[PDB]
């Protein structure tokens, strides 16, 4: 979360600790995203920081265009897999872990998002809304 | 606006391959098929419009429906269909049984009949 995130976010189950790799779901040239940090996460001895739906992470691209590899950039988690629970009572989950590469302000690097996108992320990051097909 | 299609079952929409000779698809070219969205044949509140046909009349009159009555645009043209729409025998000779539609030129009112076939 943080910059450019207009909205607050209700807690959702943390799915992705540091080291996790999600699918890159944009058209940027990136094939996956390797999580090295979660923004706005706190501190407890021994705890991995771990992201969830609509969290902004800091990632590198393990697989993808060489102009994207070997460096750290912001991304946003768009699909989960660890099931979480909404305030309408529902426990839900996607089939994959996936997020999209983005700028500190929260602008997509790419122009499409392939696959669905959870609403809690859509609601959080307007330029993600824009590029989303099926939401939730 | 997607049309229902008898026989699907489903109260949802689905996309089907459609062919010559079928509902919700009119082909542009010989042997063309199109994959098209279509609505299920099961009524839901997702419908803008239900299409009903009256089968039995109720106890009371509905104005634009029972009160009003509307002429069948065109009459029999083929020989034996004239024979049937009048019950005739292959004796009676058609020609003077064909329909005759009056229509005016202003001060010249005319009279047009089909052109019997078979």
């Amino acid at each position: 979360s943080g910059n450019g995130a207009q909205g607050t976010k209700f807690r959702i189950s943390l799915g992705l600790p540091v080291g996790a790799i999600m699918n890159c779901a944009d058209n940027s040239g990136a094939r996956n995203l390797y999580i090295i940090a979660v923004k706005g996460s706190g501190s407890r001895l021994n705890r991995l920081p771990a992201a969830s739906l609509g969290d902004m992470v800091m990632a590198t691209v393990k697989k993808g265009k060489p102009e994207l590899r070997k460096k750290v950039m912001p991304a946003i988690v768009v699909r989960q897999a660890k099931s979480w629970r909404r305030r309408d009572g529902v426990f839900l989950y996607f089939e994959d872990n996936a997020g999209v590469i983005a700028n500190p302000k929260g602008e997509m690097k790419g122009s499409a998002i392939t696959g669905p996108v959870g609403k809690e992320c859509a609601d959080l990051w307007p330029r993600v809304a824009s590029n989303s097909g099926v939401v939730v | 606006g997607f049309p229902m299609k008898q026989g699907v079952l489903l109260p949802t929409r689905i996309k089907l391959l459609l062919t010559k000779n079928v509902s919700c698809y009119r082909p542009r070219r010989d042997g063309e098929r199109k994959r098209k969205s279509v609505r299920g044949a099961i009524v839901g509140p997702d419908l803008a419009v239900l299409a009903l046909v009256i089968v039995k009349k109720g106890e009371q009159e509905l104005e634009g429906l029972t009160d009003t009555t509307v002429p069948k645009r065109l009459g029999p043209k083929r020989a034996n269909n004239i024979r049937k729409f009048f019950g005739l025998s292959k004796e009676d000779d058609v020609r003077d049984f064909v329909i005759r539609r009056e229509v005016t030129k202003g001060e010249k009112t005319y009279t047009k009949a089909p052109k019997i076939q078979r």
């Binding site: 307007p126 809304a129 824009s130 | 509140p45 997702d46 419908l47 803008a48």
Partner: protein, 608 residues
């Protein structure tokens, strides 16, 4: 290497007096020091001229100018590619033009000074584009070449040959009364002559526009809304292929502007080409198939974008940014208070404000009825409804300007009032007038942001009000009402003559002062968005225009909006991205579902 850039200088002659400064521009410029050409003196008109070729882009001259007469900007050579026409040296230049298409309606939207008016003339054949050059003696031939690569090229060949003669509904709303009297004699005469179409067309067109009463009146006599509509009538009646409308929503009320939009669209059905320019988004959305956005600084330049979709163009407009152009055309984004956002106070003040009983005012040709309502302190009430309903009459009675036929409202309160139609009738200059009302309001920082800096009143200060302009005068009047202290303030139709940025400056103005000062305000309006921002309650007027009317007590925002919008029968669901009203078509399932819920509009509120 580095990207490419340019310099463009535009100087306002009104602002410039070389005597006081001296031709300081030449002396201070570093290029001229060296012996270069950047600023040349024109002995004739006695004006400074700045050549764009030799200028450095230093901006030294701009700072030195005592007034603020010179403006130099640096662009990435965005403007140079597109040059259509320029008025003269160091003046407004137009860039790109809007595409016309047959069988459809193409919209145009922009802030004032963009050249939307100019663009119409060029398409009309009234003015020939110079092409940012000499082109003058009818050189239509060169214009097609300039347009090559654009769809307008075909249109320009058509125009030169004069196969088509476009019909234009004139833009300047203030200018029209002077030009025509009668049309010659009375509106009725105009409609009979112009009617190339059906005899049905005379009757039908009048009925839909609500022109029935107005036929006997003369054009000069007409009120602003009436004046607009007669022009629209003539643009349907005419026989032609191309019908150009330039700002058809001006002066019109909320009900009427929607009506105008439908009728204009009917032209597309006969497959006649239509073009239209609008300041109103509600109106623009309904009319158009395709939309162009015009952007750039006012009076400096204005470029037309490539053609876009109806939905798409509107969405981009509200962002305040355009990607290809990469310009943030508007400094701040428009937002509406949620109503969660507002401050929470227990309101009464002295226990509630004053209250008015039933009132009636009858002219003898029109009758107004008012239902007893109450007003409270520190609140804001919107007044909506069609003109001729007695929205204006009601406010006057509260002002004490008018005496009620029945009912009475004698309050102890001090009232400040702003009239609806503003025509100058005060001798004196602008600064003198505003200073008499209150100085010190002029000192405040709020007033610098909203009035003084945007327009540049400093230059206006010497100018006469008779000599003045429409929109500029409007912002000044609204501010003046706020100039003096009063328990209650009354404003009538602040949106007139104003573009997008201008109105929204006003919206912030009324809400902020009222909240702060803890005073009450009544505002009359046609603009949906303006009412929403300012108000807490609303009064809706109903009845039939030019006949009778009725008023209601104040009711909550949700309640009042449902009633008003129910009269129109257009729902404005919500767009998820823009949070904008999204219009809903008649007979529908989604729209039908809403009718059963009672939601005409949506905001960041709970609701299905």
């Amino acid at each position: 290497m580095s990207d490419k850039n340019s310099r463009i200088a535009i100087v306002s002659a009104d602002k410039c007096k070389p005597k006081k400064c001296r031709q300081e521009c030449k002396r201070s410029c570093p290029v001229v020091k060296t012996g270069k050409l950047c600023i040349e003196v024109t002995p004739t008109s006695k004006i400074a001229f700045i050549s764009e070729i030799l200028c450095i882009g230093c901006g030294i001259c701009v700072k030195k100018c005592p007034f603020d007469a010179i403006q130099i900007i640096n662009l990435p050579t965005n403007l140079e590619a597109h040059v259509t026409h320029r008025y003269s040296a160091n003046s407004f230049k137009l860039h790109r033009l809007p595409t016309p298409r047959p069988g459809q309606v193409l919209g145009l939207v922009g802030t004032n000074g963009i050249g939307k008016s100019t663009a119409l003339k060029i398409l009309a054949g009234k003015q020939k584009p110079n092409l940012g050059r000499f082109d003058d003696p009818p050189e239509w031939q060169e214009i097609i070449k300039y347009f090559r690569g654009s769809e307008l090229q075909n249109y320009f060949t058509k125009m030169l040959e004069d196969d088509i003669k476009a019909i234009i509904k004139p833009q300047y709303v203030d200018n029209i009364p002077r030009a025509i009297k009668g049309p010659v004699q009375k509106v009725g005469e105009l409609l009979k002559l112009r009617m190339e179409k059906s005899p049905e067309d005379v009757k039908r067109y009048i009925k839909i526009l609500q022109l029935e009463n107005v036929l006997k009146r003369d054009i000069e006599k007409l009120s602003g809304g009436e004046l607009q509509r007669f022009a629209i009538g003539m643009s349907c009646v005419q026989e032609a292929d191309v019908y150009m409308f330039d700002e058809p929503s001006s002066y019109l009320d909320v009900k009427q502007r929607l009506n105008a939009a439908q009728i204009i669209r009917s032209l597309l059905a006969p497959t006649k080409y239509v073009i239209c320019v609008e300041h109103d988004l509600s109106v623009l959305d309904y009319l158009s198939d395709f939309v162009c956005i015009i952007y750039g600084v006012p009076s400096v330049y204005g470029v037309v974008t490539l053609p876009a979709s109806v939905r798409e163009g509107i969405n981009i407009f509200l962002d305040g940014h355009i990607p290809a152009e990469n310009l943030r055309f508007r400094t701040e984004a428009l937002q509406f208070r949620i109503a969660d956002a507002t401050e929470d106070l227990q309101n009464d003040s002295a226990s509630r404000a004053f209250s008015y009983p039933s009132l009636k005012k009858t002219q003898g040709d029109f009758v107004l009825n008012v239902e007893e309502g109450e007003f409270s302190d520190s609140e804001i009430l919107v007044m909506m409804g069609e003109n001729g309903t007695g929205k204006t009459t009601l406010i006057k009675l509260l002002a004490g300007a008018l005496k009620p036929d029945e009912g009475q409202d004698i309050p102890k309160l001090n009232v400040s009032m702003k009239p609806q139609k503003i025509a100058p009738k005060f001798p004196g200059t602008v600064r003198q007038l505003f200073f008499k009302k209150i100085r010190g309001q002029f000192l405040n920082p709020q007033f610098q942001t909203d009035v003084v800096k945007p327009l540049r009143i400093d230059d206006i200060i010497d100018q006469e009000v008779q000599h003045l302009s429409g929109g500029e005068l409007q912002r000044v009047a609204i501010v003046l009402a706020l100039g003096i202290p009063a328990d209650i303030y009354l404003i009538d139709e602040p949106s007139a003559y104003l573009d997008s940025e201008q109105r929204i400056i006003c919206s912030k103005v009324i809400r902020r002062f009222i909240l702060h000062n803890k005073k009450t305000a009544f505002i009359v309006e046609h603009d949906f968005i303006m009412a929403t921002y300012l108000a807490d309650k609303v009064i809706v007027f109903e009845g039939i225009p030019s006949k009778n009317a009725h008023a209601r007590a104040p009711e909550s925002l949700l309640t009042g909006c449902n009633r008003f919008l129910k009269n129109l029968n257009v729902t404005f669901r919500r767009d998820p991205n823009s949070f904008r009203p999204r219009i809903n078509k008649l007979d529908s399932q989604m729209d039908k579902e809403q009718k059963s819920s009672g939601n005409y509009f949506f905001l960041d509120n709970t609701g299905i």
